[PDB]
Design a protein around this ligand. Structure first.
Ligand SMILES: NC(=O)c1ccc[n+]([C@@H]2O[C@H](COP(=O)([O-])OP(=O)(O)OC[C@H]3O[C@@H](n4cnc5c(N)ncnc54)[C@H](O)[C@@H]3O)[C@@H](O)[C@H]2O)c1
Ligand SMILES: NC(=O)c1ccc[n+]([C@@H]2O[C@H](COP(=O)([O-])OP(=O)(O)OC[C@H]3O[C@@H](n4cnc5c(N)ncnc54)[C@H](O)[C@@H]3O)[C@@H](O)[C@H]2O)c1
Ligand SMILES: O=CN(O)CCCP(=O)(O)O
Ligand SMILES: O=CN(O)CCCP(=O)(O)O
Ligand SMILES: [Mg+2]
Ligand SMILES: [Mg+2]
Lengths: 408, 408
């Protein structure tokens, strides 16, 4: 049985992964599950799956340990980043599903690449922040990365075998890859005024017509920063630069992305927008298995729309491309600034449209820009350099926010 | 240089193939070209490409031989089926592009499979009439068949490598193929009354909103018999039965077909509707090359529509499925009856809607049905059995036509 560690098992992605595991009992073995806040849910999962190890936040380690011994499970309990690193590099784990949101998922993603694991990547902030380091580290140790993110999973499915195996093979012109097309729903405000986004409630922004997801990715979809980040994720995953990856607005969320070839062929993945499809694909690869989705019904589709992005309205996307060209430092500035203006939007401290302002101000800040020219990809020293800039952007972005609520 | 024989070089498919050859001068060598009626065009091609051999109709052999000696080419001239068989099995030919329309292309398609060639198949009537025989013969001698037909080329592009190599691999459930979806434009009368198809001029039926093609395939698209035939072609190519292949109406002709997988993934090929894309793909396979098409612009797409087939209105499609289930005899009855009611529609002897009547009457005719249980796939005797039934359906369909213009 393929041994699984599911980092971030209590969230949206975790739910879908587990929904597939329950359909395929004697194919996968759960070795570990992790959860930051939802201690009871993690316990309920523990009791269901009898995992060898679980990990939670340090604030909950004691509480959860009591509850696990009280339930008489053999389960080892772990806490913090230290626990995640352990599970991610555990000799007994074959496959890691990286579903921790944000930067918090970076160190365990690396540990997994360092340990040579099969990694199923949901956690895109890992690649936006440490793409060179993660891929380099993975290549060096024999880790395979398969993307779970819909768009990337689509693209991956639409790529010849040799380029799934080795992403550098994509520069051999025989394979004829021209460019990659990322589909974007346009989010909750696509078809609404600039003015109306300004006054968006969290309830409006957080709820998406086609997808049910975590809070963060949800907001990122509303501003289109999600595509931004996906743009940078794609560059690392498929070993390309941003000019080779373009974005098309597609509100139906049926077409999940395309690969354009030199002969005129666009290979695309279509499906109902349900993350069990890409998770299932990535779990069973190179085989396939039933996912439990309700399949897309082509008869009732109606009309699938396509539309160029409106960049004035979705500045987050302009700014992500700009950052992708600047390299890893600017992508960190990008992602972290954005991580901060999201905690801030959901806390109701800024407007939705303020997410763009904070992120630019951060990309164009002189104190942030000093670190753009650093070697964030050094095998020994890249990690501390990435985290230090993280802490730094955290401070400055926080400062920018406070400054804005009055004036600069 | 890959040596090419282009059977049917003067038609629509031939034009597109050659348009690609002219873009790729030192990749492909033209060893042979063939043309039935258009002697001057065949000559002009001869002078352009200095082929080793060409073949024409028997009625033109003398005329063309004079003209070739008058122009001082070294080119060997051939005639009739005998000439096609020779070119198709020529020791010096690597690749055969099978683009003769109708049943007339069957014997040379077989000769090419018998000789173990790489075959690029446009000519779908070959598989509708002798699918088992062609595939069996190909497998036995090491011939590779790559489809040029848009839908089949799309499906092929959307299939894993192992199933492109060996079509029987598709029954291994690991690969997770659920079903194949054939897209159909719905033709010139999709959005028009039954009543208005009745009175269709040849000019209406022959001209297609999105495609420029030969006359026959053009009419077949109007009645939707083209999808019928494509349905049977798909069964042989991909080694499935008709229940596994469904049809969706898609008027934009952008999405060219899909492959549905068990996890919910639909892989589809999109592109501007231009046969240079699939020809180019098939020529360079497993590599890719520029095709000279103007690529699809996703920004200006608008809305791609999808719609269930209206089977009352497109009886030809009901009847093809029925025939696919009946087996090869009924497919011959189907294809030939249809070949006859097309010569008859374009000659202005029957109504467009009469194509359906003639073909049913032929499928349900007791004299035709006697031969349904024959072994059309016997390596020694299948070919004469296929041609005899052809001649027979030709006679009876002709009779049915004459009968209808008065009454049965
Ligand atoms: N939700 C989707 O459908 C979807 C689609 C594509 C990509 N993704 C990506 O997958 C990842 C997870 O997204 P999600 O929507 O499931 O997130 P979520 O908000 O549902 O939470 C995910 C998990 O992260 C854990 N977590 C949160 N903060 C943590 C911390 N500081 N340390 C350790 N663990 C922590 C939570 O306990 C939870 O199990 C993200 O990177 C997201 O961008 C999600
Ligand atoms: N035209 C397209 O875009 C297209 C698309 C998909 C499939 N196809 C298929 O490819 C094949 C070619 O179609 P097309 O539209 O290019 O045809 P066409 O009518 O334009 O050309 C047919 C070719 O075959 C030759 N031919 C015709 N009758 C013959 C006979 N009785 N004996 C010997 N040779 C003969 C002609 O000389 C000509 O070169 C058909 O089977 C068609 O269904 C064509
Ligand atoms: O992989 C799935 N997602 O990231 C959800 C996408 C929401 P968006 O298409 O509006 O970016
Ligand atoms: O391969 C291309 N064609 O067969 C032209 C198809 C026209 P249709 O979609 O109405 O069958
Ligand atoms: Mg995504
Ligand atoms: Mg076709």
């Amino acid at each position: 049985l393929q041994s699984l560690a599911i980092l971030g098992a209590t969230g949206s992605i975790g739910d879908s992964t587990l929904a597939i595991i329950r359909q395929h009992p004697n194919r996968y073995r759960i070795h570990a599950l992790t959860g930051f806040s939802r201690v009871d849910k993690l316990l309920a999962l523990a009791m269901e799956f009898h995992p060898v190890k679980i990990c939670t936040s340090p604030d909950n380690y004691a509480q959860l340990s009591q509850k696990v011994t009280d339930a008489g499970l053999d389960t080892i309990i772990l806490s913090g980043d230290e626990g995640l690193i352990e599970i991610a590099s555990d000799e007994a784990v074959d496959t890691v599903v990286a579903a921790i949101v944000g930067a918090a998922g970076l160190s365990s993603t690396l540990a997994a690449a360092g340990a040579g694991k099969r990694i199923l990547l949901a956690n895109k902030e890992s690649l936006v922040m440490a793409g060179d380091l993660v891929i380099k580290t993975a290549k060096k140790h024999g880790a395979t990365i398969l993307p779970i993110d819909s768009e990337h999973n689509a693209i991956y499915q639409c790529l010849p075998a040799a380029i799934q195996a080795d992403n550098t093979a994509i520069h051999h012109t025989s394979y004829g890859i021209k460019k990659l097309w990322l589909t974007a729903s346009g989010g909750s405000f696509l078809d609404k005024s600039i003015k109306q986004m300004q006054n968006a409630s969290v309830k409006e922004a957080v709820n998406h017509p086609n997808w049910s997801m975590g809070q963060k990715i949800s907001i990122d979809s509303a501003t289109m920063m999600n595509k931004g980040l996906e743009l940078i994720e794609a560059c690392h995953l498929f070993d390309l630069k941003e000019h080779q990856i373009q974005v098309v607005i597609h509100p139906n969320s049926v077409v999940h992305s395309l690969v354009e070839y030199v002969d005129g062929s666009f290979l695309a993945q279509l499906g109902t927008p349900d993350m069990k499809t890409p998770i299932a694909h990535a779990l069973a690869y190179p085989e396939r298995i039933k996912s439990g989705v309700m399949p897309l019904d082509l008869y009732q589709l109606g009309s699938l729309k396509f539309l160029a992005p409106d960049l004035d309205k979705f500045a987050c996307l302009k700014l992500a491309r700009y950052a992708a060209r600047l390299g890893t430092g600017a992508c960190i500035a990008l992602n972290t600034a954005n991580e901060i203006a999201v905690e801030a939007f959901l806390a109701e401290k800024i407007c939705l449209t303020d997410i763009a302002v904070i992120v630019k101000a951060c990309l164009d800040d002189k104190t942030i820009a000093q670190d753009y020219s650093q070697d964030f990809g050094d095998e020994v020293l890249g990690l501390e350099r990435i985290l230090t800039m993280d802490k730094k952007v955290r401070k400055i972005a926080t400062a920018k926010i406070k400054l804005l609520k009055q004036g600069d």
